[PDB]
Amino acid sequence: ISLTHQLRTGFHPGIAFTVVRQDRFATEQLLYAERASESYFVGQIQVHH
Amino acid sequence: HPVDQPVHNYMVKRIHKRSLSAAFAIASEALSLLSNTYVDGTEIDSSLR
Numbered sequence: 001i002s003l004t005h006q007l008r009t010g011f012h013p014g015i016a017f018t019v020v021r022q023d024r025f026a027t028e029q030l031l032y033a034e035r036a037s038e039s040y041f042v043g044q045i046q047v048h049h
Numbered sequence: 050h051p052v053d054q055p056v057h058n059y060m061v062k063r064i065h066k067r068s069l070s071a072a073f074a075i076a077s078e079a080l081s082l083l084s085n086t087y088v089d090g091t092e093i094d095s096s097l098r
Contacts, residue, residue: 046081
């Protein structure tokens with residue numbers, strides 16, 4: 001009741017505070033998947049329902 | 050002493066009924082290879098078949 005006294009009207013405590021949030025930016029991708037490192041091994045069609 | 054008289058018996062037999070059943074699981078893989086071997090040709094690996 002008395003510390004937000006000095007935290008809700010006009011007077012003010014031997015602490016204080018520090019704004020943030022958790023806001024919004026980014027990144028993405030576009031590679032160079034290579035000539036000799038990267039793969040598969042060719043084939044199939046086979047079934048079960 | 051004429052008292053004798055041959056007798057013939059007539060017994061009949063029932064046939065009854067039995068059976069044997071068993072399960073035989075096909076893997077999708079074995080019937081898989083199956084499917085090509087029925088149309089075995091230049092394709093469909095022979096070592097596989």
